[PDB]
RNA sequence: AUAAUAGUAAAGAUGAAAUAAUAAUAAUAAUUAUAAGACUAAUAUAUGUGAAAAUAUUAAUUAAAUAUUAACUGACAUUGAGGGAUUAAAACUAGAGUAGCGAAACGGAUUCGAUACCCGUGUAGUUCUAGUAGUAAACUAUGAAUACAAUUAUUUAUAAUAUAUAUAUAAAUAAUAAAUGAAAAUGAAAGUAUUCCACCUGAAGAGUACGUUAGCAAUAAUGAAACUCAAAACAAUAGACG
């Protein structure tokens, strides 16, 4: 029947939620399903939703809550930043392992809690990564110090041998401007779904 | 009929403040039991300062000792007790208020209910 | 009719059971309750003389 | 006497009302502004102004209703304009 | 929370759309100078460059440099944004 | 009456229940007696509200009038139930003269009673007459 | 004994006139504990300089108007400075939200109340309101 | 050096975005910002001024349901409890 | 009744009241003893 | 309001001024300390609750009150002439009470005049207890009851859901469809229908006169005619005007 087709179809596939699109609180993982178009479909304003989406939007990705509201507008936000964070994490290549002595959940009524990682990493911890220069022991990643350090779409705890005064005290609260290199030690994941990275400042 | 009470007693003596309070509690409890009543709990509260300088007839008070007495009685009885409280010089403010027993039989004091313990069984345990 | 009689009686029985339970609970409690003078005096002593667990918030 | 001495004006701080603030010596003006704000929040000047004359109880009730309506309209307007702003931002 | 739906209105408009601009540079400099002169006596050379800067700013005119389409959007989008029931 | 209890209790039953509890405890004196006394005081009519007493009176009236055990709504039993309330309402009015809302309520209640007795008379006259005689009307 | 603990600057600012008042809180160093504590709580006051803006030669209507209030405040401050009640701390209080209240605070802020400010420990309003109470006059038609 | 109001401190475990460093983010954050709400009748707290004083202005006035943000019934119960409190000495 | 129409009625009522006030002593005389 | 403290020449009032139980008999402001009445800030939306008048400081007593289930009664219902009871404010009769307010009265202003609007003294009255009386724009200017009809958004309560979700119910409130309507607009009624009661039949004269009944009284109800007009009224329209 039609009903069966509807149940199958791509709008039914997007699991509904009425969480805020603007959430100024702490964001530990994606809230909403990111939805992309193709360039062609964007050109004729079609996203595979109830209505056309405004020609002002030139980004291919978005997030939404309601197909149509009482205000006669779809409730959306044109941004898909969460995919890029995931891709950055993948690039960094630091495999998430549970610091607590437990089996990997992907191997072997309902539990709504996050099964291992939320699916930002299905990488396994045992691999090395060779290159022309050699086998990479230390993962080199550029990040920004805030005061904690922003390292490729994630905030991370930082440690060092000696606190460098020349770089820090010259610009005390404009440290965000200057990008510093980092050596990421390991990535643990807590119950709330936050990725607790740990980096080391290189100079 | 379960009636809660709140009496804010006088504390004239500096070193031994609770004596007057204790005497009051004894007397009113005695009255209750003589007239078919059943005092369930006598919750003490601290030597708490009054919000304003509250005054009885030809006296003034800034600090008092507070307590709850959670007793059963007739209506008549409770009224008499209230009158006797109003009357005496060693209490600043008195307040009897009913605790409704249409649903339950065991009911703790208002403070205990606010904390969490609905019945006195919970308090005991 | 039989069904209706059962319905009438079952609810009454349940209510009776509840009342009995309540009574039992009251009885369990009632060691703390006071009727006599000596018990009242003991309670007073416990409350006041110990100088412990005065209900004050902070 | 000794007990009174020990109680070094402990009650004096808590007894006083909320219409009172300790001045910072660096900025008395700031303190005054804060006090004024507090008074505004408590609606004390407006209350004082209301209390100068008597207004018939039905008339004051009508006024109160009108004020309430005005309030509710304003936040309805605010809601509407926020939506309008969102629409503008998005493209609608 | 408590939502507040308005009735059908003739025209949704703000009567004075603020286009909150930045404050004037010359005015700021003048205030700074005033602040400096509150301290350090009348005219000490701690505020020697500040006065010069103020003069430079206020040479051609007393102020240096000399609207928000908001009620062009409300008017546009009122009929959409209404929860007005059908005809 | 002297050892009458509120909350749908009966003194004979309560004592028996207490004894059974004691026996169970033994399996698994002065103090116990004091507790029992406290319980009785709590559940006595005379410490309880007037409402409980009224309810008891209504129940008694129902028991008297019910043409079979399930009886509630028999025109006669309805009238009997009304009567107890009327008596109590009348007593309240006698205490409180200017309580006009509750006088109105009383009035309505006796009008309702009259109406149901009128109905009873039409339906089943002898029974109606008997009911009247019982109620003192 | 008579020890001055602190001064209190009172300012009643009505529609038509201001009343500025300076007063010393006089504690005696020299019975029941409760009574002593009560005495400590409410220390007796002695008035030092009373002032109303007509005292500064503002007649009839002009005394309801700011400038006059400001002048009165300045005069008060001068008196405080000269008469030598600046050794202990000061406590500012106000009443009735007149124009003159606005004047007084401005005067205190500025150079006219320069010497006083440094001793001013607390500002604390005490305007009187009524929770029902006596009925006010009928609202004038005009 | 710079003040705290013009720099968003991203928490430790959180994700961020390029936008999140901006002025506009900070403005957005600024724009967008209990036992009685938990589900217990406030008329238990009439001998607990400490807790009832939270639902009261500095002077002593009771706060409006727009401010306190309660269920209407629950608000009215709270108000009642407060009034009871001030009828007694305590509060 | 509009307000304008009511005003005629009001006026009439006032006139009547005035007449009654005037004829108080006369009314008294008429009433007693007959 | 009285008294004390210390303190100094104005204070209070208004559009601006004066008169007054204001003040060089030492006030006003301030700080205390007594007394007296009468009112009830926030919460508050009269939301809700009450038959309507009404009704928001606290407590207690007695009365009445919601929903859903179970059982019972078996049309016992609806409306309601006459009748009955309650019925704001003012008013009246007794006896207390009398702070504040405040008809009247007197005085000061304002004004050509000012029997006013503003200010000052301020008596009845407002307050309580016991009554009388039975009217108000007593208004939703809309009598009560039942069956029914298209949507949406808000809350409120009920049930299930696997306590916090998205669902089914009701209830109210706000926008409407249809329909009705002179239109304004009404919107589950001012719609579609059925039942019962009250009331209207041009404007003036008139809710007047006479009569009767009731009231301590003011008054309340009942309620005509002659005489005289072709008027009189409502919704909306466009102006002019403020
Ligand atoms: Mg009937
Ligand atoms: Mg007057
Ligand atoms: Mg008409
Ligand atoms: Mg009705
Ligand atoms: Mg109020
Ligand atoms: Mg009288
Ligand atoms: Mg007058
Ligand atoms: Mg009267
Ligand atoms: Mg009567
Ligand atoms: Mg009349
Ligand atoms: Mg009418
Ligand atoms: Mg409408
Ligand atoms: Mg029709
Ligand atoms: Mg019509
Ligand atoms: Mg007549």
Coordinates of N, CA and C (backbone and C1' of nucleotides) in Angstrom, one line a residue, chain J residues 181-233:
Chain J
rG181 P -31.5 35.6 8.6 O5' -30.8 37.0 9.1 C5' -31.2 37.5 10.4 C4' -30.1 38.5 10.9 C3' -30.0 39.8 10.1 O3' -31.1 40.7 10.3 C1' -27.8 39.0 10.8
rA182 P -31.8 41.4 9.1 O5' -30.6 42.4 8.6 C5' -30.8 43.2 7.4 C4' -30.4 44.6 7.6 C3' -28.9 44.8 8.1 O3' -28.0 44.8 7.0 C1' -30.4 46.1 9.4
rA183 P -27.4 43.5 6.4 O5' -25.9 43.9 6.1 C5' -24.8 43.7 7.0 C4' -24.5 44.9 7.8 C3' -23.4 44.8 8.9 O3' -22.1 45.0 8.3 C1' -25.3 45.8 9.8
rA184 P -20.8 44.3 9.0 O5' -20.8 44.9 10.4 C5' -20.0 46.1 10.7 C4' -20.2 46.5 12.2 C3' -19.6 45.5 13.2 O3' -18.2 45.7 13.4 C1' -21.8 46.2 13.8
rA185 P -17.2 44.5 13.2 O5' -17.9 43.3 13.9 C5' -18.1 43.3 15.3 C4' -19.3 42.5 15.7 C3' -19.1 41.1 16.2 O3' -18.8 41.0 17.5 C1' -21.0 41.3 14.7
rU186 P -18.5 39.6 18.2 O5' -19.9 38.9 18.1 C5' -20.6 38.3 19.3 C4' -21.6 37.3 18.9 C3' -21.1 35.8 18.9 O3' -21.1 35.3 20.2 C1' -22.5 36.3 17.0
rG187 P -19.8 34.6 20.7 O5' -19.6 33.3 19.8 C5' -20.7 32.3 19.7 C4' -20.3 31.3 18.6 C3' -18.9 30.8 18.6 O3' -18.8 29.7 19.4 C1' -19.5 31.5 16.4
rA188 P -18.0 29.7 20.8 O5' -17.9 28.2 21.2 C5' -18.8 27.5 22.1 C4' -20.2 27.4 21.4 C3' -21.1 26.4 22.1 O3' -22.5 26.9 22.2 C1' -21.0 26.0 19.8
rA189 P -22.9 27.9 23.4 O5' -23.6 29.1 22.7 C5' -23.6 30.4 23.2 C4' -24.4 31.4 22.3 C3' -25.9 31.0 22.2 O3' -26.8 32.0 22.6 C1' -24.8 31.1 20.0
rA190 P -26.9 33.5 22.0 O5' -27.9 33.3 20.8 C5' -28.8 34.4 20.3 C4' -28.7 34.6 18.8 C3' -27.7 33.8 18.1 O3' -28.1 33.6 16.7 C1' -27.1 36.0 18.0
rG191 P -29.3 32.6 16.3 O5' -28.6 31.6 15.3 C5' -27.9 32.1 14.1 C4' -27.4 31.0 13.3 C3' -28.3 29.8 13.1 O3' -29.2 30.1 12.0 C1' -26.2 29.0 13.9
rU192 P -30.7 29.7 12.0 O5' -30.7 28.1 12.0 C5' -30.3 27.4 10.9 C4' -30.3 25.9 11.1 C3' -31.6 25.4 11.6 O3' -32.5 25.2 10.6 C1' -29.8 24.4 12.8
rA193 P -34.1 25.5 10.7 O5' -34.6 24.4 11.7 C5' -35.1 24.7 13.0 C4' -35.2 23.5 13.9 C3' -36.2 23.5 15.0 O3' -37.5 23.1 14.5 C1' -34.2 22.7 15.8
rU194 P -38.8 23.7 15.2 O5' -38.8 23.0 16.7 C5' -39.3 21.7 16.8 C4' -39.0 21.2 18.2 C3' -39.8 21.9 19.4 O3' -41.1 21.6 19.4 C1' -37.5 21.4 20.0
rU195 P -42.2 22.7 20.0 O5' -41.8 22.8 21.6 C5' -42.1 21.7 22.5 C4' -41.6 22.0 23.9 C3' -42.1 23.2 24.6 O3' -43.5 23.1 25.0 C1' -39.8 22.9 25.0
rC196 P -44.4 24.4 25.0 O5' -44.0 25.2 26.3 C5' -44.1 24.5 27.6 C4' -43.3 25.3 28.7 C3' -43.5 26.8 28.8 O3' -44.8 27.1 29.3 C1' -41.2 26.3 28.9
rC197 P -45.5 28.5 28.9 O5' -44.7 29.6 29.7 C5' -44.8 29.5 31.2 C4' -43.7 30.4 31.7 C3' -43.7 31.9 31.5 O3' -44.7 32.5 32.2 C1' -41.5 31.1 31.3
rA198 P -45.4 33.8 31.5 O5' -44.3 34.9 31.6 C5' -43.8 35.3 32.9 C4' -42.7 36.3 32.7 C3' -43.0 37.6 31.9 O3' -43.8 38.5 32.6 C1' -40.9 36.7 31.2
rC199 P -45.0 39.3 31.8 O5' -44.2 40.2 30.8 C5' -43.3 41.2 31.2 C4' -42.5 41.7 30.1 C3' -43.2 42.4 29.0 O3' -43.6 43.7 29.3 C1' -41.6 40.9 28.0
rC200 P -44.8 44.4 28.3 O5' -44.0 44.7 27.0 C5' -43.0 45.7 26.8 C4' -42.7 45.9 25.4 C3' -43.8 46.3 24.4 O3' -44.0 47.7 24.6 C1' -42.5 44.5 23.4
rU201 P -45.5 48.3 24.6 O5' -45.8 48.3 23.0 C5' -45.0 49.0 22.1 C4' -45.4 48.7 20.7 C3' -46.9 49.0 20.3 O3' -47.0 49.9 19.2 C1' -46.3 46.8 19.7
rG202 P -47.5 51.4 19.5 O5' -46.1 52.3 19.5 C5' -45.0 51.9 18.7 C4' -44.3 53.1 18.1 C3' -43.9 54.2 19.1 O3' -42.8 53.8 19.9 C1' -44.8 55.1 17.1
rA203 P -42.7 54.4 21.4 O5' -42.5 56.0 21.2 C5' -41.3 56.5 20.5 C4' -41.4 57.9 20.2 C3' -41.5 58.8 21.5 O3' -40.3 58.9 22.1 C1' -43.0 59.5 19.8
rA204 P -40.2 59.2 23.6 O5' -41.3 60.4 23.8 C5' -41.4 61.2 24.9 C4' -42.1 62.5 24.6 C3' -43.0 63.0 25.6 O3' -42.3 63.8 26.5 C1' -44.2 62.8 23.5
rG205 P -42.0 63.3 28.0 O5' -43.5 63.5 28.6 C5' -44.2 64.7 28.4 C4' -45.7 64.5 28.6 C3' -46.1 63.7 29.9 O3' -45.9 64.5 31.1 C1' -47.4 63.1 28.0
rA206 P -45.6 63.7 32.4 O5' -44.8 62.4 32.0 C5' -43.8 61.8 32.8 C4' -43.8 60.3 32.8 C3' -43.1 59.7 31.6 O3' -42.4 58.5 31.9 C1' -45.3 58.8 31.8
rG207 P -40.8 58.5 32.1 O5' -40.5 57.1 32.7 C5' -40.5 56.8 34.1 C4' -41.9 56.8 34.6 C3' -42.0 56.5 36.1 O3' -43.1 57.2 36.7 C1' -43.1 54.8 35.0
rU208 P -43.3 57.4 38.3 O5' -44.1 58.8 38.3 C5' -43.5 60.0 37.7 C4' -44.6 60.9 37.3 C3' -46.0 60.9 38.0 O3' -45.9 61.6 39.2 C1' -46.4 60.8 35.7
rA209 P -46.8 61.2 40.5 O5' -48.3 61.4 40.0 C5' -48.8 62.8 39.8 C4' -50.2 62.7 39.3 C3' -51.2 61.9 40.2 O3' -51.6 62.8 41.3 C1' -51.5 61.2 38.0
rC210 P -51.8 62.1 42.8 O5' -53.1 61.2 42.6 C5' -54.4 61.8 42.2 C4' -55.3 60.8 41.6 C3' -55.8 59.7 42.6 O3' -56.8 60.2 43.4 C1' -55.2 58.7 40.5
rG211 P -55.8 59.0 46.1 O5' -56.1 57.7 45.1 C5' -57.5 57.4 44.8 C4' -57.6 55.9 44.5 C3' -57.0 54.9 45.5 O3' -57.8 54.7 46.6 C1' -56.4 54.3 43.3
rU212 P -57.1 54.4 48.0 O5' -56.4 53.0 47.8 C5' -57.3 51.8 47.6 C4' -56.5 50.6 47.2 C3' -55.5 50.1 48.3 O3' -56.1 49.4 49.3 C1' -54.5 50.1 46.1
rU213 P -55.5 49.4 50.8 O5' -54.1 48.6 50.6 C5' -54.1 47.1 50.6 C4' -52.8 46.6 50.1 C3' -51.6 46.7 51.0 O3' -51.6 45.8 52.1 C1' -50.9 47.3 48.8
rA214 P -51.1 46.2 53.6 O5' -49.6 46.4 53.4 C5' -48.7 45.2 53.1 C4' -47.3 45.6 52.9 C3' -46.7 46.6 53.9 O3' -46.3 45.9 55.1 C1' -46.1 47.3 51.7
rG215 P -46.2 46.7 56.5 O5' -45.0 47.7 56.2 C5' -43.7 47.2 56.3 C4' -42.7 48.4 55.9 C3' -42.7 49.6 56.9 O3' -42.0 49.3 58.1 C1' -42.7 50.3 54.7
rC216 P -42.6 49.6 59.5 O5' -42.8 51.2 59.4 C5' -43.4 52.0 60.5 C4' -42.7 53.2 60.7 C3' -42.4 54.1 59.5 O3' -43.5 54.9 59.2 C1' -40.4 54.0 60.8
rA217 P -44.1 54.9 57.7 O5' -43.0 55.8 56.9 C5' -43.0 57.2 57.0 C4' -41.6 57.8 56.7 C3' -41.2 57.8 55.3 O3' -41.8 59.0 54.7 C1' -39.5 56.9 56.6
rA218 P -42.2 59.0 53.1 O5' -40.8 59.1 52.4 C5' -39.9 60.2 52.5 C4' -38.5 59.9 52.0 C3' -38.4 59.4 50.6 O3' -38.4 60.5 49.7 C1' -37.1 58.1 52.1
rU219 P -39.2 60.3 48.3 O5' -38.4 59.1 47.7 C5' -39.1 58.1 46.9 C4' -38.7 56.7 47.5 C3' -39.3 55.5 46.7 O3' -38.4 55.2 45.7 C1' -39.8 55.3 49.0
rA220 P -38.9 54.8 44.2 O5' -39.4 53.3 44.4 C5' -38.5 52.3 44.8 C4' -39.2 51.0 45.1 C3' -40.2 50.5 44.1 O3' -39.6 49.9 43.0 C1' -41.1 50.3 46.3
rA221 P -40.3 50.2 41.5 O5' -41.5 49.2 41.5 C5' -41.4 47.8 41.6 C4' -42.6 47.1 42.1 C3' -43.8 47.2 41.2 O3' -43.8 46.3 40.2 C1' -44.5 47.7 43.5
rU222 P -44.2 46.7 38.7 O5' -45.8 46.9 38.9 C5' -46.6 45.9 39.2 C4' -48.0 46.4 39.6 C3' -48.8 47.2 38.5 O3' -49.3 46.3 37.5 C1' -49.0 48.2 40.7
rG223 P -48.9 46.5 36.0 O5' -49.5 48.0 35.7 C5' -50.8 48.3 35.9 C4' -51.1 49.8 35.7 C3' -50.3 50.5 34.6 O3' -50.4 50.0 33.3 C1' -50.2 51.8 36.5
rA224 P -51.3 50.7 32.2 O5' -50.9 52.3 32.3 C5' -51.4 53.3 31.5 C4' -52.9 53.4 31.8 C3' -53.6 54.5 30.9 O3' -54.1 54.0 29.7 C1' -54.0 54.9 33.2
rA225 P -53.8 54.6 28.3 O5' -54.7 55.9 28.3 C5' -56.2 55.8 28.3 C4' -56.8 57.0 28.9 C3' -56.6 58.3 28.0 O3' -57.5 58.3 26.9 C1' -56.2 58.8 30.3
rA226 P -57.0 59.0 25.5 O5' -57.1 60.5 25.8 C5' -58.4 61.1 26.0 C4' -58.3 62.5 26.6 C3' -57.6 63.5 25.8 O3' -58.5 64.1 24.9 C1' -56.7 63.6 28.0
rC227 P -58.1 64.3 23.3 O5' -57.0 65.4 23.4 C5' -57.3 66.7 24.0 C4' -56.0 67.5 24.4 C3' -54.9 67.5 23.3 O3' -55.3 68.6 22.3 C1' -53.9 66.9 25.3
rU228 P -55.3 68.3 20.8 O5' -53.8 68.3 20.4 C5' -52.9 69.4 20.8 C4' -51.5 69.1 20.4 C3' -51.3 68.4 19.1 O3' -51.4 69.3 18.0 C1' -49.9 67.4 20.8
rC229 P -51.3 68.8 16.5 O5' -49.7 68.7 16.3 C5' -49.2 68.1 15.1 C4' -47.8 67.6 15.4 C3' -47.3 66.5 14.4 O3' -46.8 67.3 13.3 C1' -47.0 65.7 16.6
rA230 P -47.4 67.1 11.8 O5' -46.4 66.0 11.2 C5' -45.0 66.1 11.5 C4' -44.4 64.7 11.3 C3' -44.6 64.0 9.9 O3' -43.5 63.3 9.5 C1' -45.4 62.6 11.6
rA231 P -42.1 64.0 9.1 O5' -41.1 63.4 10.2 C5' -40.6 64.2 11.3 C4' -41.3 63.7 12.6 C3' -40.4 63.1 13.7 O3' -39.6 64.1 14.4 C1' -42.4 61.9 13.6
rA232 P -38.0 63.8 14.7 O5' -38.1 62.4 15.5 C5' -38.3 62.5 16.9 C4' -38.4 61.1 17.5 C3' -37.2 60.2 17.3 O3' -36.2 60.5 18.3 C1' -39.1 59.0 16.6
rA233 P -34.7 60.4 18.0 O5' -34.4 58.8 17.8 C5' -34.3 58.0 19.0 C4' -34.3 56.5 18.6 C3' -33.0 56.0 17.9 O3' -32.0 55.8 18.8 C1' -34.9 55.1 16.8

